[PDB]
Every structure is written in structure tokens, then in C-alpha cells.
Design a protein around this ligand. Structure first.
Ligand SMILES: Nc1nc2c(ncn2[C@@H]2O[C@H](COP(=O)(O)O)[C@@H](O)[C@H]2O)c(=O)[nH]1
Ligand SMILES: CCCCCCCCCCCCCC(=O)O
Ligand SMILES: *C(=O)CCCCCCCCCCCCC
Ligand SMILES: *C(=O)CCCCCCCCCCCCC
Ligand SMILES: [Ca+2]
Lengths: 283, 267, 68, 68, 267
């Protein structure tokens, strides 16, 4: 049995008239302000039991956030074969909620919990019959051969980790180790994938700059394993990521404006975070 | 003490020495000091090259000028030193390089001036490109200015057409050219040179990365940014000007992977 | 191989003291060979705000002149 | 009849030392009468590359003349 | 031993490694090995720069060619390396430099060739100028050839008039261009590459001077000279040719007096 650390309690204090001035400081030093109630006013004694138990990075990142929505269609019509499967690039930039949070830190390190939610429906009036669907999520790491058709040899997965879902069952989920090839996950990257030497374009680099130019986690090749039926059916698969067993370094300000692309990039369309206030003296 | 003022301070590295009679303490980034790679944290197996004094000294960049119009400035480590004496040579002759630095921003005025520079040292300082026609579109040449470094502006005008204006950072001051309110740039190691208080800024910074040692010629760990949180001002003219000088000194530098020298694209 | 631990004080629970009864114990038995598969790591309330609010070299104490 | 064992060091885990906490223990209870039904056999990192990289009769040591 | 032949030998420094299966031992100049300046022998008071691996490695000079006509070759340390990678940088950025080296002269032929090269390492190798109109008349440019080094001849024709032919060494082989019979060049650390016996020459040499550390850009401590004591010969043609390669490696290098880089006169 143990007692979680509580937030500073307030010890009772009173007047003062010393040469000790906790009120004044010099933030030029780079040090934040330190004063607390006791230093400025007369306080009473207060026993604080409350804890920052929920601001613990593990709690703050303890949610299965949706990262992307993939679509695919099992159809029996002419050009509906390439539709019989889909390939998603692993990343959290597809959305903005989770992304922003992680984006609070320069580097991070964690294990990952993938959770998948499937939702199928009928497109046109082809509201007929179709047996139950069995999907396959295949993780194709960088370097592994990718599926040509919704059914070429690649879906054997003799080495690639694959899930097999039977629509209607509990949302398949699985865990992934910290796989980064670095000592930590890099969230930003003020560099280029390679060094452009003396005799090259006076623009070289514009193609390979940014974290995006060096990061690569492979892709998720989803598909329905059933064959094509009379009526066409459409499925939407949603990817959920929850970074667990985490720890991060170097805090940075939150993304204040809309996100453009995978990089920092802003759009002149929306770069006014704040809001006009009547007057500087308007409560 | 014998009057050991928090204001007066001396710094020495190699054969270089800074002094300052009006500083406001000094800060040590994230509370850690520069260190070398420990046998338990090492990666490259070749015996490293540790330049010591030959490269771990005080290199002074070409001063810039603070005007009532000035919007801000920026630089990149190790970039803004790639040409600094011996440090550079080592930096370029080696594939992998590691280093921390002591940043000393100088800027004296007079008891009759006003002004406040926010000197921030941001790790992994990635800025947005100036062209909404592409993403992460910045040329190596433009990303790595060197001793000159860049400057911040207060306007954002992307060149979706002119592809030679897109390949450069969109140094938007009120957003750090990152898309984050500069008002919170303080969550980074920093100091503020408020003219009525100090005239120097000293920030010691340790290597920072998701790796022990990295490839300097491709990656700039730190980024130095200076924004006038308080506009320069002088009772006399309505066009006052004061010099701002930046002197950087690398520390605990070590390199691995020696070969022929690296010479990047240039104009 | 099970490991028992203290729960998170709930509604009508132990005075915040979390030191009242075994009725606040939860059991845990890791089932997989890979750590990655485990639940959230135990709540850690440690913290050092100073590496951010005061990474100054020479230390200054409230009651003194920040600039001496 | 359960047998506890060490997990595979994960993300925010014990310094590689795998010698930190019981929080790295997983339990195992075989349920079937036939061994074949059991999980993957325990990770065995033993190895003798020599039966392939040096199956030479007379042994030669690096520092010496391979052909004496 | 397990057959530890006096002929086979490996050498390693920095990330460089020489090997040779036919050498004839190796010699250590005057019996002393390279060392650093000891606190009791020091002179410059600034903390020295000791490059270690970055500069103390095996740099290979452009090979030359041994012909039945070849009269000899020569080079100068540190000169013939002033352009060799990192070593050079350090050499030129510092006023004072100190170093010893491991010289490895290579030259393989076949059991059917004849020939014998006398590899001598002469300290303070001063040669006479080619002009009897002046004395000690040699230009810096000519005195310091570099990777190329000079060549010996067997004739002495001074240009008392043409002052551009005087400003160069009179590399008279049978006199070392010094005015001393080469027959006694053996009172210097040396080895002989006799083709029927060996194909390598290894001579480790320690810093030598009337001072602890000196100014490299002005002074060449050692001079490497190779004279065919036995003319190259091959049963086949009457114009045989074999390559001679010279690989030098500095050791225990340390420099004092760091400033802007030195760039000497050139053409
Ligand atoms: N504020 C305060 N100061 C007092 C009182 N009596 C004496 N002092 C003087 O004020 C000093 C500081 O005490 P105070 O708590 O700031 C004491 O050391 C004493 O010299 C009192 O009742 N109130
Ligand atoms: C069968 C499903 C396999 C899923 C494999 C996902 C690979 C994980 C890469 C890590 C992605 C999050 C890290 C990050 O971008 O910060
Ligand atoms: C320590 O583990 C001893 C207590 C065991 C109690 C049984 C728990 C149920 C089985 C755990 C999963 C085993 C999977 C093979
Ligand atoms: C050793 O096995 C003692 C621990 C027993 C704990 C109970 C585990 C749950 C039952 C195991 C399967 C039994 C099947 C008949
Ligand atoms: Ca408390």
C-alpha cells in the first residue's frame, strides 16, 4: 500500500515587512515566475490531497484515437478489382486530434495498440444479397512486396503479420513494440534525407526535406477475402492508435493553426488563431 | 562573497573568452550539460575524433542590426558554423558528428533605450515552406544559410507559381514560421535581453536528438531565434539602430566515420 | 505470478489516504510473452518542473534579488 | 502448475538488463495433455556459427598464418 | 610461434591498415618511438590539439615509376602531406606542429626481376640550389613540391642566368644533392627494397629537431629519399617499369597556436 504524491498544500502564513521580496524577480534569466499565494498574501493552512494523476503522459495519451478511414469495395463490375483492396500508409498525420497531442513533444518513445473498426454498407440500389464478409489486414514493412491485385500471392503472409476479421465480431486489435530504428521516435526533423553535393541542382533538397522524407513504417494492405458477389458492397475500415508505455522529451508549443500536409506548412487561408477583443480593458 | 555579482560573468573555451558586466545569470538547457557518448550508449564502433580546443571554442557570427522595423532573426546549429575554422573541417570530413554549444547573444545600448529580445534555442526547428503549391518544399541551399542565417517577417505570401520563391522558409514571426504562437516559444530554453536590465544572453545547450550521434551535414539539431518582444526604441530618432552579435561555441564534439571531405551544393 | 496493487480511490472510498482495506486491490497477471502487450504502465506522479521553469545555472532563491 | 517467466523487454522498459521488476513476468499454464498443443518454445539464443564458418580440422587463430 | 614470419606484417593507425607478406623487418629510427611533449619539455603554454585518429593515419601518395633510366626520388615531411585530409587542416590552422611518422614504401615485381631501392629517411634534408650565381637560392614553391616530391638526376647544370632555374634544388644523385657521397647515406635510418628479397620498407620515425615543437609551414623535419642502388632489370624488355608507392602515416601529432588558416604562395 502506498500514497500518490499530492499537489503542494498551502501552509498558513501572515504579514511581513522584510527585505525578502518573493514578489519581485527578473524573468530575463529565462526562469519562470515562482511566487505562490504564501509569498504574496496571508494564507490559511490547507491540506491538499488532489493529484496530477491524470496529466501523466500515460493517462494523457491513454486513448484509442482514430487515425484514418480506409475505404474499399468488393464489386463484380468491370473496373472494381482495384477497388477490391486498398493500401494505407502508416502514420498519424491523416487526422489532427492525436497528431496535435503527440506534436506537443519533439521526441517520444512507446508501444502501440492498434484497434480496427469495420462498417459495411450498400452503395447504389444493388441492395441485394451478399454472404458475410471476412477481411484481412496485412502489415507490409518497408521492402516487402506489395499486392498487385486483391489476390496476388502476397496475401500469403508467411512473414508479414496479418489479422483476419469476421465482420460482426469484436473490433480486432493488437499490440506493436517500439519499432523505431532510432533510440526514440522523432516527431520533427530539421534535416534532409541525404546530402546534396557540389555539382547538383541549385534547388536540390526541396524534394527530400522534413521528417516525412526520412520516416517510414510501411503500409497496411486491407481487403475482403470473399470473392465478388452479384451486388456490390462497400466497406469502411477505421484505424485506431493508442500509444502506451510512453515517454516524451523536449516540449514545444501546440499546433495553433490548421494543418497543411504532413509538414509544419501553413495555409494563408487560415492563420489567425486568436480573436479580436473589443478593448484591452474589456473583461 | 567579495561581491560576486550575478550580472558579471566570464566564459572560456579553447583560446576564446567572453565577458559581460550586465548579464542575467545563464541557463543550462533542460538542466543538462554537454557530455560525450558513454560506452554504454555508443553506436558507431570506430574510435571517435574529439577535437577539443581546436574546435570547441568561441566562433563569432557576423552581427546583424536591430531596427524599429526588424522582425526577427534565426540560425541553425551546426549549420551556422559549417564554415567556422577548425570545427567545420572536422564537421565536413566526418559522416557522423555530435556536439553541444554555449550560445552568447550580445547587444548593448544605453540607459536611455528600450527593447527586449527573446533569445530562444529550439530543438528540431522546422519551418513551413513559402508555396502552397507544394509541401515541405525547401531547398538545401535555402534551409542552410550559415553565418548569415535567416530573418523573420510578419507577412505570409506563398509563391505557388514562382518555384524559386517556394523553396524557402516562410519565417512568419507571430507563428515562428512553424504554425505555433510565438507567445509560447518560452517552453524552450531561453533568456530575454531586456535592454534596461541586461546586454547579454548565455544559453548552454547539450546535444539533443533521438540518436546519440547523427549526420550534421543533413540535420540541424538546434535553431537559434531572436524576436523583439519589445520593439527597439530611442528618444532621439524614430529610426534607432543597435548591433546584435551572436557568438557560438561548440562543446564535447566528437565525430565518427572519416572519409573524403563533404562539399555540399552551393551557388 | 499475479501481482496485486492499489486501485485508484473512487467515489465512496478510503479517505484519500488510499490506505483503507484490501477492497482497493486489483490483480494483474500478464498473459503475453511480449511486454508491449501489457496494460498501461503504472501511474507515475514524479516530476521535475524545474528543467523547464528554472534551468538557470546559478541558483536563485525566491526571497533573494533575482539579479544580484 | 503455472510457470512464470521473463517477458521480452518492451518500449519504456527495464534498461535492456531485463532485471527490473516483476512487472516483466508472464504466466503460463499448459492446458492440453499433448505437448504439441503448447505455445512457441522458449526463445533460445544459443548458437555455434563455427560448424559453418570454420569446420576446419586443425584450428587456426586469427593472428596466425592461415596457411603455415 | 605459429609461424610468425619476420616477412609477414600488419600495421594499423586510425582507420587505415597496411599489410605485406615479404617485408624485411621494420626499423625504428635511432631506436626511439614517437612520443608527445612531456610537461617538463613543453614550451607553448596553450592547451595543444591532438588529432589522434582524424589525422594520425595512412595517407597514400601518388605512385611514381621505376625505369631503367630512373635516377631517384625525394619528398619532405610534413610537406608531402600538407594536402592530406584532416592532417593538413590541423597543420595549416596552427602556428606550431609536432609529429612523427610511419613510412611504408611499396614496390612489388616478380621472382624474375632485379633491383634494389635504398629508402633513406634523412633529418634536415637540405639540398644545394641550381645556380652558381647565388647561394641557398631556392623558392618556397620549388622547395615544397608536396605529394609529387622531386626527383634526382645524375648531372649538375646550374643556370646562373635564368633565375627561374636557379630557384630549385640540384638533386644530384651520387651526392644526395647535398655534397656528400650517397654511398654513406646509410648513417640515416633506412631499409633496402631488394626485389629478390622484399617488396616493402617500413621505417617508423620520431619527431627530430633542436626544439620540442616547431612551425611546420616553414620547416620540413624529415626528407624521404629513394635511390636505385641496383638498377631495375627484367629479362624481357630493355625498358622495364614497375610502380613504387609511398604511404605515410603521422603519429603523436599535436599543435599549438591556433588562428586563421595558413595558405602559402602557389601557382
Ligand atoms: N511584522 C512584525 N514584525 C515585528 C513584530 N514585532 C517585532 N517585529 C520586528 O519585525 C521583524 C520581522 O518580523 P515579521 O514577522 O516580519 C522582527 O525580527 C522584529 O524586529 C510584529 O508583531 N510584527
Ligand atoms: C497488423 C498491423 C501492423 C501495424 C504496424 C504498425 C507499425 C507501427 C509504426 C509506428 C507508428 C506510430 C509512430 C509515430 O509515427 O510516431
Ligand atoms: C502466478 O501466475 C500464479 C497464479 C496463477 C493463477 C492462474 C491465473 C490464470 C491463468 C493465467 C494465464 C495462463 C496462460 C497460459
Ligand atoms: C498450477 O496449475 C496451480 C495453479 C492453478 C490456477 C488455476 C488455473 C486455471 C485452470 C487451468 C486449466 C485447467 C483445465 C481443467
Ligand atoms: Ca500536499
Amino acid at each position: 500500500v502506498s500514497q500518490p504524491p499530492s499537489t503542494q498544500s498551502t501552509e498558513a502564513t501572515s504579514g511581513v515587512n522584510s527585505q525578502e521580496v518573493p514578489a519581485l524577480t527578473a524573468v530575463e534569466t529565462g526562469a519562470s515566475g515562482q511566487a505562490i499565494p504564501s509569498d504574496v498574501v496571508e494564507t490559511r493552512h490547507v491540506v491538499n490531497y488532489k493529484t496530477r494523476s491524470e496529466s501523466c503522459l500515460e493517462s494523457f495519451f491513454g486513448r484509442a484515437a482514430c487515425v484514418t478511414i480506409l475505404s474499399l469495395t468488393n464489386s463484380s463490375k468491370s473496373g472494381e478489382e482495384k477497388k477490391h483492396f486498398n493500401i494505407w500508409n502508416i502514420t498519424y498525420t491523416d487526422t489532427v486530434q492525436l497528431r496535435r497531442k503527440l506534436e506537443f513533444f519533439t521526441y517520444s518513445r512507446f508501444d502501440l495498440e492498434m484497434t480496427f473498426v469495420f462498417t459495411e454498407n450498400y452503395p447504389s440500389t444493388a441492395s441485394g444479397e451478399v454472404r458475410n464478409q471476412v477481411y484481412q489486414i496485412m502489415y507490409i514493412p518497408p521492402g516487402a512486396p506489395r499486392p498487385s491485385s486483391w489476390d496476388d500471392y502476397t496475401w500469403q503472409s508467411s512473414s508479414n503479420p496479418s489479422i483476419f476479421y469476421m465482420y460482426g465480431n469484436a473490433p480486432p486489435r493488437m499490440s506493436i513494440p517500439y519499432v523505431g530504428i532510432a533510440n526514440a521516435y522523432s516527431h520533427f526533423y530539421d534535416g534532409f534525407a541525404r546530402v546534396p553535393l557540389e555539382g547538383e541542382n541549385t534547388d536540390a533538397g526541396d524534394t527530400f526535406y522534413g521528417l516525412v522524407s526520412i520516416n517510414d513504417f510501411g503500409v497496411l494492405a486491407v481487403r475482403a477475402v470473399n470473392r465478388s458477389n452479384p451486388h456490390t458492397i462497400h466497406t469502411s475500415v477505421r484505424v485506431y492508435m493508442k500509444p502506451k508505455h510512453i515517454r516524451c522529451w523536449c516540449p514545444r508549443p501546440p499546433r495553433a493553426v490548421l494543418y497543411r500536409g504532413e509538414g509544419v506548412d501553413m495555409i494563408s487561408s487560415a492563420i489567425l488563431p486568436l480573436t479580436k477583443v473589443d478593448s484591452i480593458t474589456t473583461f | 562573497a567579495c561581491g560576486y555579482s550575478d550580472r558579471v560573468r566570464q566564459i572560456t573555451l579553447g583560446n576564446s573568452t567572453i565577458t559581460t558586466q550586465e548579464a542575467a545569470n545563464a541557463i543550462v538547457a533542460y538542466g543538462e550539460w554537454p557530455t560525450y557518448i558513454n560506452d554504454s550508449e555508443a553506436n558507431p564502433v570506430d574510435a571517435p575524433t574529439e577535437p577539443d580546443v581546436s574546435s570547441n571554442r568561441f566562433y563569432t557570427l557576423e552581427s546583424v542590426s536591430w531596427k524599429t522595423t526588424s522582425r526577427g532573426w534565426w540560425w541553425k546549429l551546426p549549420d551556422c558554423l559549417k564554415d567556422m575554422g577548425m570545427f567545420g573541417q572536422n564537421m565536413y570530413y566526418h559522416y557522423l558528428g555530435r556536439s553541444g554549444y554555449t550560445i552568447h547573444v550580445q547587444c548593448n545600448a544605453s540607459k536611455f533605450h528600450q527593447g527586449a529580445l527573446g533569445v530562444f534555442l529550439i530543438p528540431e526547428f522546422v519551418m513551413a515552406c513559402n508555396t502552397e503549391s507544394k509541401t515541405s518544399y525547401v531547398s538545401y541551399i535555402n534551409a542552410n544559410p550559415g553565418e548569415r542565417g535567416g530573418e523573420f517577417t510578419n507577412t505570409y505570401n506563398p509563391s505557388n507559381t514562382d518555384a524559386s520563391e517556394g523553396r524557402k522558409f516562410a519565417a512568419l514571426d507571430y507563428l515562428l514560421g512553424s504554425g505555433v504562437l510565438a507567445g509560447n516559444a518560452f517552453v524552450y530554453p531561453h533568456q530575454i535581453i531586456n535592454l534596461r536590465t541586461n546586454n547579454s544572453a548565455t544559453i548552454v545547450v547539450p546535444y539533443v536528438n533521438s540518436l546519440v550521434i547523427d549526420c550534421m551535414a543533413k540535420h540541424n539539431n538546434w535553431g537559434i531565434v531572436i524576436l523583439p518582444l519589445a520593439p527597439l526604441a530611442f528618444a532621439a530618432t524614430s529610426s534607432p539602430q543597435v548591433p546584435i552579435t551572436v557568438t557560438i561555441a561548440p562543446m564535447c564534439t566528437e565525430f565518427n566515420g572519416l572519409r573524403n571531405i563533404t562539399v555540399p551544393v552551393h551557388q | 505470478g499475479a501481482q496485486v496493487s492499489t486501485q485508484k480511490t473512487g467515489a465512496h472510498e478510503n479517505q484519500n489516504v488510499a490506505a483503507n482495506g484490501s477492497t482497493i486491490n486489483y490483480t494483474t497477471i500478464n498473459y503475453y510473452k511480449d511486454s508491449a502487450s501489457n496494460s498501461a504502465t503504472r501511474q507515475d506522479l514524479s516530476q521535475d518542473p524545474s528543467k523547464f521553469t528554472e534551468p538557470v545555472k546559478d541558483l536563485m532563491l525566491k526571497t533573494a534579488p533575482a539579479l544580484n
